[model samples]
Target chain A: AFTVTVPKDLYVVEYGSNMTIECKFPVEKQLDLAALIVYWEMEDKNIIQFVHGEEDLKVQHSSYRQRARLLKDQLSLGNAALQITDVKLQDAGVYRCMISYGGADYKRITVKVNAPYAAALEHHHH
Target chain B: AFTVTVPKDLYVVEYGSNMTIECKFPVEKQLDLAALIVYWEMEDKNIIQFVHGEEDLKVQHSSYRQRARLLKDQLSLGNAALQITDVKLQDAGVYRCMISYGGADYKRITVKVNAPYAAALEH
Candidate 1:
């Protein structure tokens, strides 16, 4: 049997900043990432390929280029973490971490990217 | 722009029982369900098409027959509720309520279906 776990249900980040989303799995059976399809979905649309294997990095969306990167080293340790840089407001949505073996297994982390200045002002006001 | 909302993050039910999964949306622009695809996914293995329009009730999976139903009336009220009956342990997982417009929008609710006898003993 295998199990998957994620950090928090919701993660808050500021615009133009960097955020790291973490996912860990406990696999009783050894598997190969190349044999499986690992993908990410925003809200439910805009499917992008983060990492197919140890060497392949295919970015389907041009806008997402340079904004997303996969930490393959972590995957070697049974952790699949995605690092998103230069966050934008449009990035605010539910991000799902999905892995497909014979079936699809996944967990979701909701990300909210706030405007830096607006967040600072609100924080100061409070 | 459109907004979608799910009732809860998780739901628990028992095997051999019924379940109702719901999805509601607020669309600033009107759209038709017929033009869109309405399907359901279990975990990530098999993709089943539930309802495509007012008349189409295709069961992509033979096992799922008579176990799933779509309440169209709820959709008219901007509520997309999936009623599942005779729930089984395999039904336990995260169910996502998704809509695709110019982009995809969705929320997920995790459902835990316990064995009837086991659930009763715990309760």
Candidate 2:
């Protein structure tokens, strides 16, 4: 049996910043990127999905288009992290990282986007 | 084994409108509401969690406070529907309905909030 691991259950990020949510699983052997299926979803909406060694944007949600991606080259290292750029307030949600080869395992990572001013104020007082 | 059923997987509502997302399970017998655990979550945040026949709001997220609730009286009929009032744009997300008695079962429903003008314009 295989298992998935998420370094953290929650991630807080500054608004409009780029963020990466990491998840990893065991790669017993080199995986065929073309044969692997990697998918991400947030708030029940598709952020991105991969197959045939490329992203299938037709199933991706408009709000996440051009903003989300998986490091395709890192799959062989068991990395299934999602990199989201220019995050928006609406981007805060639970992200599901799922990978399927012979079997599939998935994990959830919650993201909170704090306004730039709010983050700065907190840091200033510290 | 028991299973949960959702009337619809997706619900579209006008912004600022009140909405109810229904979920049902087999009630083998009249459940002791006090002994049953009912919970709701959205975007990985707790909307509400029920125990002892009452809502435990301490775990509820601030955004859902005073806005999310379960119809307690309908539990006997296997209704675990959540009633969300004055929905906001941020409220548009996947809602998880979960119930526990002897065993637990859950289901998800996705809610989409449409602008009032956009909805009216379409019709």
Candidate 3:
């Protein structure tokens, strides 16, 4: 872990909604475009991983099929964001990302998926 | 097929957003109080099927995993809307709801999923 950092400590995404985790390189190393190997994990779950500019979700956890993806095009731009779709209650937890290049960088972010069905039901009354 | 009817002929959902396909019996048949078998399909692909009350999405099309679902609680009230999350361009097409009871009921609705990426980039 080379002291990787994420822009936010927490993100609130509506349940059953799609959301992206912001991952990036250090401010001074934005232009450091060395060969990169990045893998994203959620608790004990493996979301997705990328290497040599190619995305691989084949090894992803069963709960995550097309549900998780890596932004391949943005990889070269020092962005290793992970996009997840159809978030469920079980998705609420901490996420980790490991970026290996000139050096290794590790980052972590928190996610909270909420259904808030009551809110929607309330709208019907109005 | 009972020639079921939906509230709309076309539905517009934003790409990557969530949308629902509304299905119901005729105004008079909603409370017919008959057991039902409902299956949702998109363009020939199986999205989900529910019998009695159990949901069967295991046979769902490749693109639709946890993406599609049946509103179980609403079923008793005559609501059979199918909710799909993370709408994608490939998801745009005709969706069919086949509900069975005294007879078969078939309903159709067109879906247009647009990414509208420009608006997001502009924002």
Candidate 4:
């Protein structure tokens, strides 16, 4: 039986801020960082970015071109977290955390953005 | 943006027989299921099925449990083919074939097998 472990429950991130999604696996010394690939995708069917590992094979969506970053140093500690900056309402959706080794393990997280700063401005202006 | 269309791919059958995978979306409606929740991972991390959605999501492993399936139905009409039978390996994955549904719209597919055929088998 292959085993994958991830945090349960959705995470809340405010819009216009930064947020990270964490993924964990239970395989001991078996995980070779260099041989694995990690990535993130939206539930809506968009490839966010190849967050880390063997850089060349990574694929990034044109929309998130400059907004996604991976914390490689943290990966060694089993922290496969995707960091998204300047969050927008469009960012609110289900995000997948995946690991590809002998096989792939995935976890889903729902992100919700609060009322946008633009909306706050509109109210004041009106 | 570009768009994809799929059939909302879904089918049902007994546990010990053959099975096929299908996927379709409304592109005029704008969709691409591969960009959605289309991989079948056992609700556990164990990858039982990659089903169909993309040649890449098309990732298959050593212990399928060997009993999974897919049916293209006929692609010019928009069919992505995957077939499995002799039903033995593990053959039960969440099996998702999703389409990226533009800025809005969402749907889900669930597959269930009848009695005498277990939902999943022991490794």
DockQ for each of the predicted structures, in order?
A: 0.04, 0.04, 0.01, 0.06
| DockQ category of candidate 4 | incorrect
lDDT of 4: 0.51
**Model 3 chain B: worst 10 consecutive residues (lDDT sum):** B26-35
* Residue B70 displacement in candidate 2 (angstroms): 1.0
Best by DockQ: 4
Model 2 per-residue lDDT at B11: 96
Evaluating just chain A, the predictions reach TM-scores of: 0.74, 0.86, 0.80, 0.75
- Worst ten in a row by lDDT for model 3 chain A: A26-35
Q: Could you give candidate 2's per-residue lDDT for residues A4-90 as a string of tens digits?
A: 889898999988789998888778877766546667888678887776677777768889879998887788888888899997777
- Model 3 stretches with alpha carbons more than 4 Å out: A26-34, A117-126, B1-123
The clash count of every prediction, one per candidate, is: 3, 0, 2, 28
DockQ ranking, best first: 4, 1, 2, 3
Quick one: best lDDT, which candidate? Answer: 2
Q: For residues A1-126, what per-residue lDDT tens digits would candidate 1 score against the true structure?
A: 234688677999988899888777654466566444455667644344543364233433555666777677776566777788888776788887765333334678899877867765764575
Predicted structure 1: lDDT: 0.63
Q: Is candidate 1 or candidate 4 better by lDDT?
A: 1
- Model 1 stretches with alpha carbons more than 4 Å out: A28-31, A50-59, A101-103, A117-126, B1-39, B42-123
2 versus 4: better lDDT goes to:
2
User: TM-score, B chain, candidate 2?
Assistant: 0.88
TM-score of chain A, predicted model 1, versus the true chain A, to 2 decimals: 0.74
Give residue B8's lDDT in candidate 3 (0 to 100).
88
Where in model 2 is the C-alpha error above 4 Å? A1-126, B117-123
Of the two candidates 3 and 4, the one with more favorable lDDT, higher being better, is 3
Candidate 1, residue A71: Cα displacement in angstroms equals 0.6
